[PDB]
Amino acid sequence: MTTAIVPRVSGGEEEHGHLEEFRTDPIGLMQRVRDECGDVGWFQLANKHVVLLSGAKANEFFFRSSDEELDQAEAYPFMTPIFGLNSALRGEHMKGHATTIEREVHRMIENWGQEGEIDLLEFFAELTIYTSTSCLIGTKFRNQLDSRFAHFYHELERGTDPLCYVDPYLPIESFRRRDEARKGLVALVQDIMHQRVANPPTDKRDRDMLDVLVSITDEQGNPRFCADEVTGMFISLMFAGHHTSSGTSAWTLIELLRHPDAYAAVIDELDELYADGQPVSFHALRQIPRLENVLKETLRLHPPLIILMRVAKGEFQVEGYPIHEGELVAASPAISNRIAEDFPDPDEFVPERYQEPRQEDLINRWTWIPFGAGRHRCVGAAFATMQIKAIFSVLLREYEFEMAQPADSYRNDHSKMVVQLARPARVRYRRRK
Numbered sequence: 001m002t003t004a005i006v007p008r009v010s011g012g013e014e015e016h017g018h019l020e021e022f023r024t025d026p027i028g029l030m031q032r033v034r035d036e037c038g039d040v041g042w043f044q045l046a047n048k049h050v051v052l053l054s055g056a057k058a059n060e061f062f063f064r065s066s067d068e069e070l071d072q073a074e075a076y077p078f079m080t081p082i083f084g085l086n087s088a089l090r091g092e093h094m095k096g097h098a099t100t101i102e103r104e105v106h107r108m109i110e111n112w113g114q115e116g117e118i119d120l121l122e123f124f125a126e127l128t129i130y131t132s133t134s135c136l137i138g139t140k141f142r143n144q145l146d147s148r149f150a151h152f153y154h155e156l157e158r159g160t161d162p163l164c165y166v167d168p169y170l171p172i173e174s175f176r177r178r179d180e181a182r183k184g185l186v187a188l189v190q191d192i193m194h195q196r197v198a199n200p201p202t203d204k205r206d207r208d209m210l211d212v213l214v215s216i217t218d219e220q221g222n223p224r225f226c227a228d229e230v231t232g233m234f235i236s237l238m239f240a241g242h243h244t245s246s247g248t249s250a251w252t253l254i255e256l257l258r259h260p261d262a263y264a265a266v267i268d269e270l271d272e273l274y275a276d277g278q279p280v281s282f283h284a285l286r287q288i289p290r291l292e293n294v295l296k297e298t299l300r301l302h303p304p305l306i307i308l309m310r311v312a313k314g315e316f317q318v319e320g321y322p323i324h325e326g327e328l329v330a331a332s333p334a335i336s337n338r339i340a341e342d343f344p345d346p347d348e349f350v351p352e353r354y355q356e357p358r359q360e361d362l363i364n365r366w367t368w369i370p371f372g373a374g375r376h377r378c379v380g381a382a383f384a385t386m387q388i389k390a391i392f393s394v395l396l397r398e399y400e401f402e403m404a405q406p407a408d409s410y411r412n413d414h415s416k417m418v419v420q421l422a423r424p425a426r427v428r429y430r431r432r433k
């Protein structure tokens with residue numbers, strides 16, 4: 001009667017609590033937490049006690065917390081088996097990156113020809129393997145990669161089943177495949193490193209991050225870094241960028257196809273913009289208003305990170321409720337982005353939301369959170385937005401697209417903590433005049 005108890009959401013009668021619901025319909029679970037509990041409720045993942053926050057006030061507490069109060073890395077048990085930016089994300093690099101991104105889109109569609117069909121999952125996942133490695137690690141390194149790298153990295157992402165809260169090394173097939181894939185990536189990187197040590201650049205202009213790394217010496221004069229550590233570093237350099245860009249690119253195309261008036265306006269704007277003959281490295285770095293608002297609304301409806309988790313490293317209070325040391329704390333862009341009082345008609349695709357009168361992203365900084373907020377904002381948000389603009393500047397000016405299945409049949413796979421499209425998700429293309 002003196003101290004409150006955070007209410008537990010219904011369900012979760014199994015021995016690991018709500019874990020099984022969390023690996024089938026996590027968004028429905030979080031929606032129930034909101035509906036039954038309000039701004040502060042909790043659900044159970046194995047032995048973990050997840051305090052789910054929602055609404056502007058609780059979200060603000062989350063996003064203002066320090067890295068030392070609410071610990072990010074400890075909330076994600078798959079990070080250890082997977083793993084083992086003054087660099088790429090300086091604005092001075094964006095123009096060069098846009099050029100790289102255009103080039104990779106060109107390479108992906110080189111052999112498309114006049115007409116055909118693609119699987120959205122494969123297409124955007126592979127494309128963003130190459131954009132991510134080239135922009136975030138270097139073009140010299142990406143040039144020494146092939147599809148074997150793409151497919152191993154994919155299996156890493158598929159190694160994120162929430163069963164990792166029982167045990168990140170549970171003897172299940174997707175975890176075995178994950179760990180084998182990490183070994184395969186170490187082997188690819190090891191061969192590349194062998195070739196780099198054999199051929200150190202004689203011109204410092206030819207050195208990339210890997211050349212520097214393999215040159216580093218320890219106190220006995222021996223290589224400080226082995227292939228395992230290098231692989232882990234490179235995985236971590238691109239892990240925040242790949243699945244998010246892949247999913248967001250796919251859903252941007254899907255929402256364009258579900259809304260052909262928005263598709264038409266975006267195309268008309270792109271054709272008129274690029275009629276000045278300036279290249280993608282120019283336009284992708286300046287305003288493309290209708291495409292930008294389509295992207296903002298795609299992010300609102302389909303945020304690639306549906307939950308953001310932390311481990312409490314102390315006792316806290318939020319809206320009169322305690323959070324105890326060791327409990328997990330979470331915010332949910334999936335739920336937050338659709339709060340009706342902030343986003344009228346929240347389930348509807350309305351890119352006008354972001355135009356001057358409404359500006360629903362800017363005036364709801366604690367509930368419009370596809371990129372996070374406060375002290376935990378996506379550091380690659382500008383790179384991610386530029387990349388989408390460059391990708392669709394190429395794709396939509398050179399090809400036109402059509403759904404190959406009903407509009408309502410595109411859906412996400414939530415079986416893993418990394419979100420990706422569910423099958424089927426296919427689209428037709430035809431080359432433009």
Ligand code: HEM
Nearest residue numbers: 240241244245248305308370371372376377378379380384
């Ligand atoms: C494509 C759309 C993207 C979205 C919606 C997105 C979303 C987010 C979110 C919500 C966070 C906060 C995570 C948390 O505090 O728990 C975050 C953090 C971060 N993001 Fe992104 N992201 C995207 C793409 C990218 C890209 C392309 C990169 C790198 C080039 C990147 C790099 C990072 C980094 C470095 C952090 C902070 C460290 C971390 O939390 O891992 N993101 N992002």
